[PDB]
Ligand binder design. Structure first.
Ligand code: NA
Ligand code: NA
Ligand code: NA
Ligand code: NA
Length: 400
């Protein structure tokens, strides 16, 4: 699994109590909640638990350890590293207006409310969002997958097919002429911001996003299976994506259509959602963050840059639990005691709509990668469950 192996007690875990995570994963397969999955738990640079469960596809063969997964929104922290590499080269600053780097954003308008004909009343945006706000989902851009007529801006991005564009130039031109959810800096709201960050990687680097991520991240870290598509020779390791249908609530093939397909290179590669990866590949990415920018003698970020990314960038003012802030393209647990969560302060995490999850806990020097392909609801449960089955198994000193 191209990362050092160890007994649980070398990570500081009870073997007996870690079996409870193994057991919960098997109970989730047995009771038909998921076809299968892969989990990786590492502490002090050594993998202490690495296990495959159930099946790749529902009828067929067992889940291999190097199964390939749609990681969806969990691509966002990878785009953040790409963006912070361009930061170290001086090509953009957090205080820059996004419109310095995307001039069409000069024409941004905001939905104030609706008139009697159910049309948004549109005002020119007060000012450009900042790059800091783009990296934090506080730029006021709308969400791209909600046909919600109570949020005009989201309705318009959905109707404009923002995420199913012909190119990243297209995506960004559409966004520039479409209503914003809100003025920049007003609230945190999950948005297309990482998909826009992707255009900025391309504009600033002179390379397409998939080339820039390959040369600067995946090849240097040995993330051999991480890409915006699954080449023909690897299609046999792809986990299949299952849903729960109404009535019987049992494992059904999922339908998503065209633009989500991972068999061909995508027209508009999504910095917020397009990557496939393996548990092993994502584990290497997680350890590079714990090492503050370096893996196996390969340095891709300065430690100051990793430290910046993994702090809360949300203003004092600030919809997602108590003690919970947000860094550069990641959630951060500023004060997890406030929500009774077991992770250490400074823990960074995220997850994907296909039910993959991870967290990196610098204070406890550990991380956890959870891989399934199950739409809506159950994936987040496994995340919270894993943490419990993980932090109950963890034995540390009282030394403060
Ligand atoms: Na580790
Ligand atoms: Na606009
Ligand atoms: Na932490
Ligand atoms: Na994961």
């Amino acid at each position: 699994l191209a990362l050092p192996k160890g007994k649980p007690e070398e990570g500081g875990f009870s073997a007996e109590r870690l079996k409870r995570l193994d057991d919960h994963m098997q109970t989730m397969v047995d009771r038909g909640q998921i076809a299968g999955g892969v989990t990786v738990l590492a502490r002090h640079g050594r993998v202490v638990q690495a296990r495959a469960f159930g099946r790749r596809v529902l009828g067929g063969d067992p889940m291999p350890m190097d199964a390939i997964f749609r990681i969806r929104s969990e691509t966002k922290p990878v785009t953040g590293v790409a963006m912070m590499m361009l930061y170290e080269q001086g090509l953009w600053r957090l205080d820059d207006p996004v419109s310095l780097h995307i001039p069409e954003f000069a024409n941004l308008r905001v939905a104030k409310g609706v008139d009697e004909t159910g049309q948004p009343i549109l005002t020119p945006v007060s000012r450009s969002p900042t790059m800091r706000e783009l990296m934090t989902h506080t730029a006021g851009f709308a969400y791209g997958l909600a046909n919600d007529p109570s949020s005009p801006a989201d309705q318009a991005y959905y109707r404009a097919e923002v995420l199913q564009s012909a190119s990243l130039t297209d995506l960004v031109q559409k966004v520039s002429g479409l209503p914003m959810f809100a003025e920049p800096g007003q609230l945190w709201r999950y948005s297309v911001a990482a998909d826009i960050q992707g255009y900025i990687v391309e504009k600033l680097s002179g390379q397409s996003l998939p080339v820039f991520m390959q040369e600067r991240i995946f090849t240097p870290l040995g993330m051999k299976d991480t890409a915006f598509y699954v080449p023909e020779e690897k299609q046999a390791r792809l986990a299949a994506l299952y849903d729960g249908d109404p009535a019987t609530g049992q494992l059904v093939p999922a339908v998503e259509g065209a633009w989500r397909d991972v068999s061909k290179p995508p027209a508009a590669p999504l910095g917020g959602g397009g990557l496939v990866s393996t548990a092993g590949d994502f584990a290497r990415f997680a350890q590079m963050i714990l090492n503050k920018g370096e893996l196996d003698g390969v340095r891709i970020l300065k430690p100051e840059t990793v430290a910046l990314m993994t702090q809360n960038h949300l203003p004092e003012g600030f919809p997602f639990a108590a003690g919970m802030g947000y860094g550069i393209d990641m959630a951060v647990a500023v004060d997890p005691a406030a929500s009774g969560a077991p992770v250490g302060p400074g823990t960074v995490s995220w997850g994907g709509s296909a039910g993959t999850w991870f967290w990196i806990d610098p204070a406890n020097n550990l991380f956890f990668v959870g891989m399934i392909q199950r739409l809506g609801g159950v994936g987040p449960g496994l995340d919270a469950q894993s943490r419990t089955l993980v932090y109950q198994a963890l034995e540390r000193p009282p030394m403060p």
